[PDB]
């Protein structure tokens, strides 16, 4: 069908992209980077993140495939030497699609803005101290003071969430995980400490206490938001779809990336 | 209907039990500790754990209620002063049932035995070093050496799982979480470190490397198992049913128990 | 002798300062904020930090005293109601001095600058990724990638160092502790993870890998340093001197601030 | 001088021992396992621990040397291929001695017993719950409930202490570090959480609350002590002496064992 290929931009990924385009020309495969039905990312996980946000408005009509020219990524889980076998299998079709949950972030002001995250979304202060009240389904849970907070998708738990002590989470679970960044706990400040895992339709809201400026990240994107009234996290109704051609289980991918390959 | 009441055995819980039995005598409520349809636990979370394992073979025909005479427990979430209002509401019926997932543990030998856990199940060594190979859905994930491993239900994540760095997990999520107890990580030993969260139908198997004797705990029960060949963890098809009369959300219960009440 | 008093600037601390000045006027006590021999800080730990850096060039000729108008601080360990008893005891003299170690930070460019820290000094990136090589006594120990690194004094271990998992450390130990901020550990990145505690004359040097811009903090001060070639940490030869009038042990102060008071 | 050699007992270490004995016979070196002045340990760190406790009553008249037949140990820091160069250098003498601090453990009953630890000493319960009051220099610091507590020497911080989140500590620092094993922290139980580092002459005392039976470990030794009234930890006045022939810094040894070799 219609397809497009993005590249890390280095010498290896560019020519792998040109070789796959040539191989696709031998089939009923049309290159289209406007309405593709298959998006191939050649590079690292950062390259795949850019490809996802490049087409985050047609997620239900797109199947993503990642090819790792460097090391094995959690999203780019195809080796470069298997590119030709991928072209053939991709041209035929009749493959199985696999869907991972995504994180919806809403930032209200005093017109709201929404973002979609594949890894996570984090909130930090704009210079001074970071203090927010954490509200869960309209119930005040805690007043957090520290460096910041991180809300991760299931597939994002092996990323920033992992470095913050968060738990690793299978992507078949439609949920999101909240982790602390250097929370203060003394006589006057108290947080839960533990990571929190929230199911679908649970809404975690962050509300300012004094400063209303926050540095909000969505995957690699990081924007300074001013006059913030609320930051709302919830599992998105949208999901990302991967084209899967062989069995590469999540825990196997975890083992290869962190234990040994 | 048919009901029974268990007690912590102290002076306060025994007389609260006798007062509720008397109040139940004014309704169409029959006391039966053989085939009860409502099981009332008066005491702490340990008292509720004993009540659960006391009737773990009729979980689908029983609704549990916990009353905390000491402090607020995650399972005993009714105050003693609300006992009479509980009797009346319980006698009428037409209440809503709430179900939490449970953990199935299977211990094979060289005849297998199965156990049901409401909080967690843990494995430790019988004296010497603890070394097990961790297999996930027939895939070897890691060789663990340390003090032990803990597999927690969602409602158990606020218990032993919490003290081991595990994440707190909403009980609507049908899953189980594995946490490490003092794992060794050097040049020759490597573990994931992070807690792992497994969905339904995922089977985590522990297999001995040298010593085949393990101290296996299931909630408060702790038995020394000899000649062990495998320990299988998976989310149980069985679920525990709570009788719920008012809104007491899980995160609110977490806030009251750990942040402030 | 010569003395000065600094204030948090709020209504309570200003008038407590004026009352102590008046009480000092009844003794052979001269107010001098240029060459004081006793520096009294009225406010929080942040107020005491400002008083320390206000006179960091005459530390060997100054004894510090902290009065906490808000809550008990680790440095402001005198209650406001004990101000008059403090005036009398301070006027007589013949008190015992207590010394805590300090952290020396050196930032070299391509003219070096030195800083003195009572709590800690931290390094973060200027926007992008933070990657530094960690060198210990001219030996390359690790390549760190993450949010940043924190080097704490003994008295600073109960502060930022504590929130990062660092160990609490008695101030009689002349040493410094290094803790990680969200380190990346996968197939390509490896750090020690554990906090490191360094004795006197050990030099920990941070060296850039790509980006040479770093946000370097020294207690409350935080400056963006450009064209950085090296950041050198070592236990300072300088020490801060506290005027001590009664037994208030460090672990007791830890118990009151974190366990209960 | 007088010397002795202990062996792991496997085929490789036994013959390396016999070869060094033969090489020692060509010098003024007398084999004596009763009053040796040089103790050579061939095996792992466990073999070295046994050699230390084998001669813990003549530590001031003994210099220890570790040879690692398996992997590099923190105490056995000599490769087997360097055995002959070690014989020659050891026969000549005039080498530099290096001393590490040790941990003194005292267990009182209702006749006290004292132990010496090179790695650490830990306390756990005898079956039920572990609850102790922690007293620091006669001041009650906390009531600990959990799995247990670990008190580590500086050289022991890279061992069990490391797996419990403790900080790594240079052995030139005469001190001891206390770490928690799965502490309970809720509405009724509160511990410091962070590891604690204690200087010389600080006495940490553990006192029972209910159960007076404890499983107390001292390095590899683990004994069930009954009718316990107190467990006293303090930095020992005794120190272990290593024979050092070349520069092998502690942090370099840490890097090789945990980062890469
Ligand atoms: N202090 C931090 N610690 C940990 N992580 C951080 C931090 N700061 C930011 N980040 C992560 O940086 C991401 C952006 N950069 C591209 C990517 C990625 C990635 N995604 C995953 C994943 N889902 N699972 C396992 N590894 C992953 N990586 C791998 O992240 C590593 C770092 O970039 C590379 O090794 C990727 O290959 C952010 O989104 C956040 O997650
Ligand atoms: N080193 C340990 N650290 C933490 N925990 C441990 C440990 N060792 C064992 N355990 C837990 O001991 C349980 C058995 N005892 C009755 C109970 C309970 C309980 N269940 C929960 C829950 N689900 N959520 C929040 N708190 C809970 N408790 C509360 O546990 C506290 C301790 O008993 C009391 O404060 C209960 O009130 C085991 O099952 C395991 O979980
Ligand atoms: N994410 C962070 N987490 C923890 N900490 C951080 C963080 N970010 C920054 N910081 C600390 O902020 C300090 C600057 N602000 C004044 C102070 C202080 C202080 N010093 C100590 C101390 N030595 N021991 C115990 N508590 C202390 N405080 C108490 O810090 C709390 C916060 O300000 C107040 O409760 C003080 O009372 C920095 O220096 C760094 O340490
Ligand atoms: N759950 C646990 N987690 C961590 N550790 C534990 C645990 N349970 C017990 N232990 C440690 O077991 C020691 C007894 N066994 C011989 C040894 C040793 C040793 N000493 C050190 C050291 N000083 N620094 C770095 N590594 C060291 N080892 C290395 O410990 C590893 C395990 O035995 C091997 O890799 C040795 O080589 C105890 O003393 C305690 O420390």
Tab-separated table of N, CA, C and O in Angstrom, chain D residues 87-185:
chain	number	residue	atom	x	y	z
D	87	UNK	N	55.546	-14.453	45.126
D	87	UNK	CA	56.469	-15.180	45.999
D	87	UNK	C	57.757	-14.390	46.190
D	87	UNK	O	58.218	-14.175	47.318
D	88	UNK	N	58.356	-13.948	45.081
D	88	UNK	CA	59.615	-13.212	45.148
D	88	UNK	C	59.460	-11.926	45.950
D	88	UNK	O	60.235	-11.659	46.876
D	89	UNK	N	58.459	-11.113	45.604
D	89	UNK	CA	58.234	-9.860	46.318
D	89	UNK	C	57.918	-10.106	47.788
D	89	UNK	O	58.317	-9.322	48.656
D	90	UNK	N	57.206	-11.195	48.086
D	90	UNK	CA	56.843	-11.488	49.469
D	90	UNK	C	58.048	-11.978	50.264
D	90	UNK	O	58.167	-11.691	51.461
D	91	UNK	N	58.954	-12.711	49.614
D	91	UNK	CA	60.122	-13.238	50.313
D	91	UNK	C	61.068	-12.120	50.734
D	91	UNK	O	61.607	-12.142	51.847
D	92	UNK	N	61.286	-11.140	49.855
D	92	UNK	CA	62.166	-10.024	50.188
D	92	UNK	C	61.612	-9.216	51.355
D	92	UNK	O	62.314	-8.964	52.342
D	93	UNK	N	60.352	-8.803	51.261
D	93	UNK	CA	59.738	-8.019	52.313
D	93	UNK	C	59.843	-6.528	52.074
D	93	UNK	O	59.849	-6.077	50.925
D	94	UNK	N	59.929	-5.756	53.160
D	94	UNK	CA	59.985	-4.294	53.095
D	94	UNK	C	58.815	-3.731	52.291
D	94	UNK	O	58.944	-2.735	51.576
D	95	UNK	N	57.662	-4.380	52.407
D	95	UNK	CA	56.458	-3.947	51.720
D	95	UNK	C	55.646	-3.010	52.610
D	95	UNK	O	55.907	-2.862	53.805
D	96	UNK	N	54.648	-2.372	52.009
D	96	UNK	CA	53.774	-1.452	52.721
D	96	UNK	C	52.502	-2.167	53.157
D	96	UNK	O	51.902	-2.918	52.382
D	97	UNK	N	52.099	-1.929	54.400
D	97	UNK	CA	50.883	-2.503	54.958
D	97	UNK	C	49.733	-1.514	54.827
D	97	UNK	O	49.925	-0.301	54.952
D	98	UNK	N	48.539	-2.040	54.570
D	98	UNK	CA	47.332	-1.238	54.423
D	98	UNK	C	46.268	-1.813	55.344
D	98	UNK	O	46.045	-3.029	55.356
D	99	UNK	N	45.614	-0.942	56.111
D	99	UNK	CA	44.681	-1.353	57.149
D	99	UNK	C	43.271	-0.873	56.830
D	99	UNK	O	43.070	0.280	56.434
D	100	UNK	N	42.295	-1.774	57.000
D	100	UNK	CA	40.875	-1.501	56.842
D	100	UNK	C	40.156	-1.634	58.182
D	100	UNK	O	40.523	-2.476	59.007
D	101	UNK	N	39.129	-0.822	58.430
D	101	UNK	CA	38.401	-0.927	59.698
D	101	UNK	C	37.525	-2.169	59.743
D	101	UNK	O	37.116	-2.716	58.715
D	102	UNK	N	37.223	-2.599	60.963
D	102	UNK	CA	36.396	-3.769	61.203
D	102	UNK	C	35.224	-3.385	62.095
D	102	UNK	O	35.235	-2.346	62.759
D	103	UNK	N	34.204	-4.236	62.096
D	103	UNK	CA	32.986	-4.008	62.859
D	103	UNK	C	32.951	-4.939	64.062
D	103	UNK	O	33.095	-6.158	63.915
D	104	UNK	N	32.755	-4.366	65.246
D	104	UNK	CA	32.608	-5.131	66.475
D	104	UNK	C	31.126	-5.310	66.780
D	104	UNK	O	30.371	-4.331	66.825
D	105	UNK	N	30.715	-6.558	66.983
D	105	UNK	CA	29.349	-6.891	67.358
D	105	UNK	C	29.358	-7.512	68.746
D	105	UNK	O	30.145	-8.424	69.014
D	106	UNK	N	28.496	-7.010	69.627
D	106	UNK	CA	28.342	-7.541	70.974
D	106	UNK	C	26.898	-7.973	71.178
D	106	UNK	O	25.973	-7.194	70.929
D	107	UNK	N	26.711	-9.210	71.629
D	107	UNK	CA	25.389	-9.779	71.871
D	107	UNK	C	25.305	-10.119	73.351
D	107	UNK	O	25.998	-11.027	73.826
D	108	UNK	N	24.463	-9.396	74.081
D	108	UNK	CA	24.264	-9.628	75.503
D	108	UNK	C	23.045	-10.513	75.727
D	108	UNK	O	22.096	-10.507	74.939
D	109	UNK	N	23.079	-11.271	76.822
D	109	UNK	CA	21.993	-12.188	77.142
D	109	UNK	C	21.447	-11.930	78.540
D	109	UNK	O	21.594	-10.830	79.084
D	110	UNK	N	20.816	-12.943	79.126
D	110	UNK	CA	20.280	-12.841	80.469
D	110	UNK	C	20.479	-14.115	81.266
D	110	UNK	O	20.049	-14.211	82.414
D	111	UNK	N	26.026	-14.453	79.662
D	111	UNK	CA	27.351	-13.931	79.347
D	111	UNK	C	27.405	-13.426	77.910
D	111	UNK	O	27.097	-14.165	76.973
D	112	UNK	N	27.800	-12.167	77.745
D	112	UNK	CA	27.817	-11.559	76.424
D	112	UNK	C	28.875	-12.206	75.538
D	112	UNK	O	29.863	-12.771	76.016
D	113	UNK	N	28.655	-12.115	74.232
D	113	UNK	CA	29.578	-12.628	73.233
D	113	UNK	C	29.917	-11.518	72.250
D	113	UNK	O	29.061	-10.695	71.908
D	114	UNK	N	31.170	-11.491	71.805
D	114	UNK	CA	31.637	-10.493	70.855
D	114	UNK	C	32.081	-11.170	69.568
D	114	UNK	O	32.604	-12.289	69.582
D	115	UNK	N	31.871	-10.480	68.451
D	115	UNK	CA	32.275	-10.977	67.148
D	115	UNK	C	32.955	-9.861	66.370
D	115	UNK	O	32.760	-8.673	66.640
D	116	UNK	N	33.758	-10.262	65.391
D	116	UNK	CA	34.474	-9.340	64.522
D	116	UNK	C	34.054	-9.609	63.086
D	116	UNK	O	34.040	-10.763	62.649
D	117	UNK	N	33.696	-8.555	62.360
D	117	UNK	CA	33.185	-8.678	61.004
D	117	UNK	C	34.051	-7.880	60.042
D	117	UNK	O	34.416	-6.733	60.321
D	118	UNK	N	34.380	-8.499	58.910
D	118	UNK	CA	35.092	-7.821	57.835
D	118	UNK	C	34.137	-7.245	56.799
D	118	UNK	O	34.379	-6.153	56.272
D	119	UNK	N	33.055	-7.961	56.494
D	119	UNK	CA	32.027	-7.448	55.580
D	119	UNK	C	30.928	-6.739	56.365
D	119	UNK	O	30.822	-5.509	56.324
D	120	UNK	N	30.107	-7.499	57.086
D	120	UNK	CA	28.974	-6.903	57.780
D	120	UNK	C	28.452	-7.862	58.840
D	120	UNK	O	28.901	-9.005	58.960
D	121	UNK	N	27.485	-7.366	59.612
D	121	UNK	CA	26.701	-8.166	60.541
D	121	UNK	C	25.240	-7.786	60.373
D	121	UNK	O	24.912	-6.597	60.308
D	122	UNK	N	24.368	-8.787	60.288
D	122	UNK	CA	22.951	-8.554	60.059
D	122	UNK	C	22.132	-9.248	61.139
D	122	UNK	O	22.574	-10.221	61.756
D	123	UNK	N	20.932	-8.721	61.371
D	123	UNK	CA	19.999	-9.267	62.348
D	123	UNK	C	18.665	-9.484	61.655
D	123	UNK	O	18.160	-8.581	60.981
D	124	UNK	N	18.101	-10.679	61.813
D	124	UNK	CA	16.773	-11.006	61.318
D	124	UNK	C	16.005	-11.725	62.418
D	124	UNK	O	16.557	-12.073	63.465
D	125	UNK	N	14.715	-11.943	62.180
D	125	UNK	CA	13.899	-12.633	63.164
D	125	UNK	C	14.074	-14.144	63.037
D	125	UNK	O	14.626	-14.657	62.060
D	126	UNK	N	13.590	-14.863	64.047
D	126	UNK	CA	13.694	-16.314	64.091
D	126	UNK	C	12.477	-17.015	63.498
D	126	UNK	O	12.310	-18.220	63.709
D	127	UNK	N	11.633	-16.295	62.764
D	127	UNK	CA	10.452	-16.890	62.169
D	127	UNK	C	9.315	-15.903	62.008
D	127	UNK	O	8.814	-15.694	60.899
D	128	UNK	N	8.904	-15.285	63.112
D	128	UNK	CA	7.827	-14.326	63.094
D	128	UNK	C	8.279	-12.963	62.614
D	128	UNK	O	9.152	-12.839	61.750
D	129	UNK	N	7.691	-11.908	63.169
D	129	UNK	CA	8.060	-10.553	62.757
D	129	UNK	C	9.315	-10.065	63.463
D	129	UNK	O	9.620	-10.448	64.596
D	130	UNK	N	10.047	-9.200	62.768
D	130	UNK	CA	11.261	-8.592	63.297
D	130	UNK	C	10.953	-7.162	63.721
D	130	UNK	O	10.634	-6.317	62.877
D	131	UNK	N	11.040	-6.896	65.023
D	131	UNK	CA	10.792	-5.566	65.570
D	131	UNK	C	11.875	-5.273	66.598
D	131	UNK	O	12.010	-6.005	67.585
D	132	UNK	N	12.647	-4.210	66.373
D	132	UNK	CA	13.672	-3.779	67.314
D	132	UNK	C	13.617	-2.266	67.457
D	132	UNK	O	13.259	-1.545	66.520
D	133	UNK	N	13.962	-1.791	68.650
D	133	UNK	CA	14.190	-0.373	68.888
D	133	UNK	C	15.658	-0.065	68.621
D	133	UNK	O	16.547	-0.767	69.116
D	134	UNK	N	15.910	0.971	67.828
D	134	UNK	CA	17.264	1.353	67.445
D	134	UNK	C	17.701	2.509	68.332
D	134	UNK	O	17.072	3.575	68.337
D	135	UNK	N	18.778	2.299	69.085
D	135	UNK	CA	19.299	3.281	70.026
D	135	UNK	C	20.700	3.672	69.579
D	135	UNK	O	21.548	2.804	69.341
D	136	UNK	N	20.940	4.974	69.465
D	136	UNK	CA	22.212	5.511	68.994
D	136	UNK	C	22.804	6.354	70.112
D	136	UNK	O	22.265	7.417	70.444
D	137	UNK	N	23.912	5.886	70.687
D	137	UNK	CA	24.599	6.587	71.769
D	137	UNK	C	23.635	6.898	72.913
D	137	UNK	O	23.571	8.020	73.420
D	138	UNK	N	22.863	5.881	73.302
D	138	UNK	CA	21.884	5.910	74.387
D	138	UNK	C	20.654	6.750	74.068
D	138	UNK	O	19.860	7.039	74.972
D	139	UNK	N	20.465	7.148	72.813
D	139	UNK	CA	19.311	7.932	72.389
D	139	UNK	C	18.452	7.063	71.484
D	139	UNK	O	18.953	6.490	70.507
D	140	UNK	N	17.163	6.962	71.804
D	140	UNK	CA	16.249	6.158	71.002
D	140	UNK	C	15.987	6.865	69.677
D	140	UNK	O	15.427	7.966	69.653
D	141	UNK	N	16.384	6.231	68.576
D	141	UNK	CA	16.272	6.845	67.260
D	141	UNK	C	15.019	6.415	66.510
D	141	UNK	O	14.368	7.249	65.873
D	142	UNK	N	14.674	5.132	66.550
D	142	UNK	CA	13.545	4.639	65.773
D	142	UNK	C	13.165	3.257	66.275
D	142	UNK	O	13.968	2.559	66.902
D	143	UNK	N	11.925	2.876	65.989
D	143	UNK	CA	11.461	1.506	66.161
D	143	UNK	C	11.350	0.887	64.775
D	143	UNK	O	10.510	1.300	63.970
D	144	UNK	N	12.206	-0.086	64.492
D	144	UNK	CA	12.282	-0.703	63.176
D	144	UNK	C	11.430	-1.965	63.148
D	144	UNK	O	11.559	-2.829	64.021
D	145	UNK	N	10.570	-2.072	62.139
D	145	UNK	CA	9.888	-3.319	61.830
D	145	UNK	C	10.108	-3.628	60.360
D	145	UNK	O	9.900	-2.763	59.502
D	146	UNK	N	10.531	-4.854	60.075
D	146	UNK	CA	10.790	-5.246	58.699
D	146	UNK	C	11.464	-6.599	58.645
D	146	UNK	O	11.238	-7.457	59.506
D	147	UNK	N	12.299	-6.779	57.620
D	147	UNK	CA	13.018	-8.040	57.485
D	147	UNK	C	14.258	-8.074	58.370
D	147	UNK	O	14.544	-9.096	59.002
D	148	UNK	N	15.001	-6.978	58.431
D	148	UNK	CA	16.173	-6.941	59.279
D	148	UNK	C	16.993	-5.695	59.033
D	148	UNK	O	16.591	-4.786	58.301
D	149	UNK	N	18.164	-5.673	59.671
D	149	UNK	CA	19.106	-4.567	59.578
D	149	UNK	C	20.499	-5.103	59.276
D	149	UNK	O	20.865	-6.203	59.702
D	150	UNK	N	21.275	-4.311	58.539
D	150	UNK	CA	22.619	-4.690	58.121
D	150	UNK	C	23.589	-3.581	58.491
D	150	UNK	O	23.381	-2.423	58.119
D	151	UNK	N	24.639	-3.935	59.227
D	151	UNK	CA	25.689	-3.005	59.622
D	151	UNK	C	26.981	-3.425	58.934
D	151	UNK	O	27.503	-4.514	59.202
D	152	UNK	N	27.501	-2.561	58.066
D	152	UNK	CA	28.595	-2.914	57.171
D	152	UNK	C	29.867	-2.144	57.504
D	152	UNK	O	29.813	-0.976	57.902
D	153	UNK	N	31.011	-2.811	57.335
D	153	UNK	CA	32.304	-2.152	57.358
D	153	UNK	C	32.460	-1.336	56.078
D	153	UNK	O	31.647	-1.452	55.161
D	154	UNK	N	33.483	-0.479	55.987
D	154	UNK	CA	33.713	0.216	54.706
D	154	UNK	C	33.941	-0.732	53.538
D	154	UNK	O	33.277	-0.607	52.500
D	155	UNK	N	34.859	-1.693	53.684
D	155	UNK	CA	35.084	-2.677	52.630
D	155	UNK	C	33.875	-3.580	52.407
D	155	UNK	O	33.765	-4.201	51.344
D	156	UNK	N	32.970	-3.673	53.380
D	156	UNK	CA	31.758	-4.446	53.203
D	156	UNK	C	30.646	-3.723	52.478
D	156	UNK	O	29.645	-4.353	52.120
D	157	UNK	N	30.804	-2.415	52.251
D	157	UNK	CA	29.748	-1.636	51.613
D	157	UNK	C	29.505	-2.075	50.177
D	157	UNK	O	28.389	-1.924	49.667
D	158	UNK	N	30.524	-2.614	49.512
D	158	UNK	CA	30.351	-3.132	48.162
D	158	UNK	C	29.693	-4.505	48.141
D	158	UNK	O	29.498	-5.063	47.056
D	159	UNK	N	29.350	-5.063	49.302
D	159	UNK	CA	28.777	-6.402	49.368
D	159	UNK	C	27.279	-6.358	49.653
D	159	UNK	O	26.514	-5.775	48.878
D	160	UNK	N	26.854	-6.990	50.753
D	160	UNK	CA	25.440	-7.009	51.124
D	160	UNK	C	24.885	-5.596	51.244
D	160	UNK	O	23.754	-5.323	50.822
D	161	UNK	N	25.674	-4.687	51.819
D	161	UNK	CA	25.251	-3.300	51.967
D	161	UNK	C	24.858	-2.691	50.628
D	161	UNK	O	23.898	-1.915	50.545
D	162	UNK	N	25.585	-3.038	49.563
D	162	UNK	CA	25.288	-2.473	48.252
D	162	UNK	C	23.928	-2.935	47.745
D	162	UNK	O	23.171	-2.142	47.172
D	163	UNK	N	23.600	-4.213	47.948
D	163	UNK	CA	22.341	-4.745	47.442
D	163	UNK	C	21.132	-4.168	48.167
D	163	UNK	O	20.010	-4.282	47.663
D	164	UNK	N	21.337	-3.555	49.332
D	164	UNK	CA	20.268	-2.961	50.121
D	164	UNK	C	20.139	-1.461	49.895
D	164	UNK	O	19.444	-0.786	50.660
D	165	UNK	N	20.792	-0.926	48.865
D	165	UNK	CA	20.762	0.493	48.589
D	165	UNK	C	21.802	1.317	49.317
D	165	UNK	O	21.809	2.544	49.162
D	166	UNK	N	22.681	0.688	50.096
D	166	UNK	CA	23.679	1.431	50.841
D	166	UNK	C	24.699	2.102	49.942
D	166	UNK	O	24.849	1.783	48.762
D	167	UNK	N	25.410	3.058	50.525
D	167	UNK	CA	26.422	3.804	49.798
D	167	UNK	C	27.754	3.067	49.834
D	167	UNK	O	28.062	2.345	50.787
D	168	UNK	N	28.541	3.250	48.778
D	168	UNK	CA	29.886	2.698	48.722
D	168	UNK	C	30.848	3.650	49.417
D	168	UNK	O	30.753	4.871	49.265
D	169	UNK	N	31.781	3.082	50.174
D	169	UNK	CA	32.498	3.843	51.184
D	169	UNK	C	33.975	3.491	51.152
D	169	UNK	O	34.331	2.310	51.186
D	170	UNK	N	34.831	4.508	51.105
D	170	UNK	CA	36.258	4.246	51.009
D	170	UNK	C	36.788	3.708	52.337
D	170	UNK	O	36.447	4.230	53.404
D	171	UNK	N	37.631	2.672	52.302
D	171	UNK	CA	38.056	2.021	53.550
D	171	UNK	C	38.984	2.865	54.408
D	171	UNK	O	39.244	2.482	55.554
D	172	UNK	N	39.492	3.993	53.910
D	172	UNK	CA	40.264	4.872	54.780
D	172	UNK	C	39.393	5.557	55.824
D	172	UNK	O	39.927	6.101	56.797
D	173	UNK	N	38.076	5.531	55.650
D	173	UNK	CA	37.142	6.142	56.587
D	173	UNK	C	36.809	5.123	57.670
D	173	UNK	O	36.212	4.078	57.389
D	174	UNK	N	37.199	5.423	58.908
D	174	UNK	CA	36.922	4.546	60.046
D	174	UNK	C	35.471	4.746	60.459
D	174	UNK	O	35.139	5.649	61.231
D	175	UNK	N	34.589	3.890	59.950
D	175	UNK	CA	33.168	4.067	60.202
D	175	UNK	C	32.419	2.794	59.831
D	175	UNK	O	33.001	1.817	59.354
D	176	UNK	N	31.108	2.824	60.064
D	176	UNK	CA	30.216	1.707	59.793
D	176	UNK	C	28.899	2.255	59.264
D	176	UNK	O	28.496	3.370	59.605
D	177	UNK	N	28.223	1.464	58.431
D	177	UNK	CA	27.004	1.905	57.764
D	177	UNK	C	25.862	0.942	58.058
D	177	UNK	O	26.027	-0.277	57.945
D	178	UNK	N	24.703	1.493	58.416
D	178	UNK	CA	23.513	0.720	58.750
D	178	UNK	C	22.481	0.876	57.642
D	178	UNK	O	22.147	2.001	57.259
D	179	UNK	N	21.972	-0.246	57.137
D	179	UNK	CA	20.977	-0.244	56.073
D	179	UNK	C	19.781	-1.096	56.473
D	179	UNK	O	19.909	-2.059	57.234
D	180	UNK	N	18.618	-0.745	55.931
D	180	UNK	CA	17.375	-1.434	56.245
D	180	UNK	C	17.106	-2.559	55.253
D	180	UNK	O	17.464	-2.480	54.075
D	181	UNK	N	16.447	-3.606	55.745
D	181	UNK	CA	15.951	-4.701	54.915
D	181	UNK	C	14.427	-4.662	54.965
D	181	UNK	O	13.824	-5.108	55.944
D	182	UNK	N	13.815	-4.110	53.918
D	182	UNK	CA	12.363	-4.122	53.732
D	182	UNK	C	11.626	-3.605	54.970
D	182	UNK	O	10.880	-4.326	55.634
D	183	UNK	N	11.843	-2.330	55.268
D	183	UNK	CA	11.203	-1.709	56.416
D	183	UNK	C	9.744	-1.385	56.113
D	183	UNK	O	9.376	-1.067	54.980
D	184	UNK	N	8.914	-1.467	57.147
D	184	UNK	CA	7.504	-1.114	57.037
D	184	UNK	C	7.350	0.356	57.397
D	184	UNK	O	7.832	0.803	58.445
D	185	UNK	N	6.686	1.110	56.527
D	185	UNK	CA	6.418	2.524	56.771
D	185	UNK	C	4.974	2.804	56.384
D	185	UNK	O	4.641	2.822	55.196
